[PDB]
Amino acid sequence: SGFRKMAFPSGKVEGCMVQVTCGTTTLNGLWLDDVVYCPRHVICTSEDMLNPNYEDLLIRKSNHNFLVQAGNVQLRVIGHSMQNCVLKLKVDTANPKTPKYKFVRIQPGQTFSVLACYNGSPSGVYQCAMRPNFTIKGSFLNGSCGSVGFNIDYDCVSFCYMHHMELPTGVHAGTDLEGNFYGPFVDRQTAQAAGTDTTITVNVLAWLYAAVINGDRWFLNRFTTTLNDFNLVAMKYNYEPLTQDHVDILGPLSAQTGIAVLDMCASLKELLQNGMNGRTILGSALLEDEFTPFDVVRQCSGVT
Amino acid sequence: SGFRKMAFPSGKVEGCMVQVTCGTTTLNGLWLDDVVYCPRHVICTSEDMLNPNYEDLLIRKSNHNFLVQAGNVQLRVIGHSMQNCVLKLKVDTANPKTPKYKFVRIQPGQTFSVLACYNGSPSGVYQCAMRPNFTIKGSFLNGSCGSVGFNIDYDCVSFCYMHHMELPTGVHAGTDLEGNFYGPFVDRQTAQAAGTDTTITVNVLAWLYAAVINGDRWFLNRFTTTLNDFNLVAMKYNYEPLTQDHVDILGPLSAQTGIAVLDMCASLKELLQNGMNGRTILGSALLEDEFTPFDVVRQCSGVT
Ligand SMILES: Cc1ccncc1NC(=O)CNc1ccnc2ccccc12
Numbered sequence: 001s002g003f004r005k006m007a008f009p010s011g012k013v014e015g016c017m018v019q020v021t022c023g024t025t026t027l028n029g030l031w032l033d034d035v036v037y038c039p040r041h042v043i044c045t046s047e048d049m050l051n052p053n054y055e056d057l058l059i060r061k062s063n064h065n066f067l068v069q070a071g072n073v074q075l076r077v078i079g080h081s082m083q084n085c086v087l088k089l090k091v092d093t094a095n096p097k098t099p100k101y102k103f104v105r106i107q108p109g110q111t112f113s114v115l116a117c118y119n120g121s122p123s124g125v126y127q128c129a130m131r132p133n134f135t136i137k138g139s140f141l142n143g144s145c146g147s148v149g150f151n152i153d154y155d156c157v158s159f160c161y162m163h164h165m166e167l168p169t170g171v172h173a174g175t176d177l178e179g180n181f182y183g184p185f186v187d188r189q190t191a192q193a194a195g196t197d198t199t200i201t202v203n204v205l206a207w208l209y210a211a212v213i214n215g216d217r218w219f220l221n222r223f224t225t226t227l228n229d230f231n232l233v234a235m236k237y238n239y240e241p242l243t244q245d246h247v248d249i250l251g252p253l254s255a256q257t258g259i260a261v262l263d264m265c266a267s268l269k270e271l272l273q274n275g276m277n278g279r280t281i282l283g284s285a286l287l288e289d290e291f292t293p294f295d296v297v298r299q300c301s302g303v304t
Numbered sequence: 305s306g307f308r309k310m311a312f313p314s315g316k317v318e319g320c321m322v323q324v325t326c327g328t329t330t331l332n333g334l335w336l337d338d339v340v341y342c343p344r345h346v347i348c349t350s351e352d353m354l355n356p357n358y359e360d361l362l363i364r365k366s367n368h369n370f371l372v373q374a375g376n377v378q379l380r381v382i383g384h385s386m387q388n389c390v391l392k393l394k395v396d397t398a399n400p401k402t403p404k405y406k407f408v409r410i411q412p413g414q415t416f417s418v419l420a421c422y423n424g425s426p427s428g429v430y431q432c433a434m435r436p437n438f439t440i441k442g443s444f445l446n447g448s449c450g451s452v453g454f455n456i457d458y459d460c461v462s463f464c465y466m467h468h469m470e471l472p473t474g475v476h477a478g479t480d481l482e483g484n485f486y487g488p489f490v491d492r493q494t495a496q497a498a499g500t501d502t503t504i505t506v507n508v509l510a511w512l513y514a515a516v517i518n519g520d521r522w523f524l525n526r527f528t529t530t531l532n533d534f535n536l537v538a539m540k541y542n543y544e545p546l547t548q549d550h551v552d553i554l555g556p557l558s559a560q561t562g563i564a565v566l567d568m569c570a571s572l573k574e575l576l577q578n579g580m581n582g583r584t585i586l587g588s589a590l591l592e593d594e595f596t597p598f599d600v601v602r603q604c605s606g607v608t
């Protein structure tokens with residue numbers, strides 16, 4: 001039935017997007033209840049970003065300096081406060097489109113959808129994974145800051161990410177909705193080392209299970225391996241070591257296909273050692289790692 | 305700044321999704337104004353699909369046999385009619401969430417977003433291209449029929465696709481919103497030849513331009529070619545012949561990067577003849593063809 005890099009339907013998040021302007025800086029804000037959440041660097045100019053003292057910069061700002069616009073209507077700001085790297089702008093109006101929501105701090109290797117916005121307007125939606133090095137490989141231009149990452153469980157939107165920075169390497173960094181950066185990144189225009197990015201092994205295996213379910217099975221072999229043998233190969237190819245927790249999470253996929261997790265590990269071991277030999281898996285010529293075992297189950301069962 | 309397979313924000317389409325049930329068959333409908341559009345095979349059972357006489361099947365159906373539910377509310381059906389392969393159910397209530405919309409019949413090689421739905425509920429959104437052989441490589445399970453493909457220009461939703469069939473080959477077929485199938489496909493569970501699928505050359509070139517803009521330039525070479533020389537190579541590798549119209553559409557990308565279209569064709573010629581040599585372009589190990597020149601411009605400029 002096909003397998004696609006699917007994002008969650010973004011409607012519930014679109015109704016929360018606002019434009020936040022402070023001075024000459026305009027970025028996106030997330031309006032939930034009577035609070036607008038945005039990156040605190042909205043108070044910075046291009047030159048302030050080199051070494052900003054956010055506490056000192058914010059002291060020169062009053063409620064009337066934060067211009068919040070939701071579509072064509074202006075929100076009245078009645079409070080402002082900084083929480084880690086996010087500003088919380090209390091407005092006098094609760095967002096009538098506020099969905100049921102939670103703020104969650106996701107784990108590296110987990111996936112989420114990103115609603116890229118400019119001037120408080122949504123332009124696109126795509127599915128991302130938080131890399132093991134806590135960066136995301138997104139698509140963000142000047143003005144995209146404040147764009148959010150989220151997951152949806154039936155009617156509840158779990159916000160997990162807010163975009164803040166583009167590192168000199170072209171990868172992206174941001175925070176959870178409490179303003180805490182994922183990784184060692186800071187909201188300062190300085191050289192920031194994004195460590196070694198490893199491949200999310202459990203996700204590659206989940207995607208191999210999705211491939212078998214959807215017809216792609218050329219890579220299945222007559223071999224098996226052990227967790228320790230597989231991890232020797234995984235280390236060599238900069239893959240995250242596979243744990244018994246990862247094996248357990250792959251349990252439903254192993255049960256559905258009848259292919260034991262360690263047998264799938266042996267297929268992955270051979271793909272790592274021999275490459276794809278000019279072939280593809282689910283329309284890809286590389287090992288895809290941005291589908292969790294939960295994503296594979298969800299897509300293969302049609303969870304709405 | 306990164307480059308992602310971005311879909312349009314699906315909010316405007318989510319508010320149009322309804323569940324249509326006829327007999328024991330349930331699929332998705334598109335509610336716009338006082339009309340619900342759905343595949344006419346909603347009137348078929350599993351056995352009817354082998355050789356259905358839609359006119360005869362529809363005659364045994366009355367307005368009260370079509371159960372349309374939008375969320376938790378039931379729509380009253382006051383009219384029903386078949387237009388090509390779609391049923392148009394006139395309801396007594398205009399959809400209050402009807403966006404500004406158009407029905408457009410896209411060209412092969414063009415792209416669009418798909419809002420996959422089950423029981424009238426959205427589960428995911430992904431970006432597709434209508435293949436040159438008029439199939440789409442989607443992600444659709446039982447119940448996904450009636451899910452729609454669309455494009456968005458500021459506030460206007462152009463609906464281009466409605467999902468109808470999964471061919472025995474695992475690829476998908478459907479119609480425009482007037483019920484006309486893309487390609488030679490019929491809404492009958494029979495063997496249907498999806499012809500040779502070619503690579504959308506103009507899209508690969510547009511994606512190579514996106515790669516250069518975003519930093520990936522290893523594939524740029526000291527060579528040039530002509531349209532005829534390039535098309536000899538394109539024919540050998542089952543690529544669509546490049547025309548002067550395609551060169552003209554790539555004009556803005558050629559202007560932005562300073563790389564002439566024929567020079568980009570020479571890079572593509574060498575990638576076709578020599579492969580990627582174990583390297584990647586925009587995180588892909590194959591030549592991506594599901595980004596039009598318009599998509600590349602839109603994403604690189606941040607059109608909301
Ligand atoms: C440009 C971009 C693209 C993708 N993702 C993120 C960004 N920008 C950043 O990393 C942060 N940049 C800025 C933070 C605060 N004030 C700023 C004021 C003027 C200009 C830039 C500012």
Ligand SMILES: Cc1ccncc1NC(=O)CNc1ccnc2ccccc12
Nearest residue numbers: 345348349350353444445446468469470
């Ligand atoms: C299964 C699927 C997955 C992805 N895309 C499409 C489909 N199904 C089809 O091609 C059409 N199938 C059916 C059309 C009408 N009535 C039907 C009644 C019972 C069962 C199936 C019916």
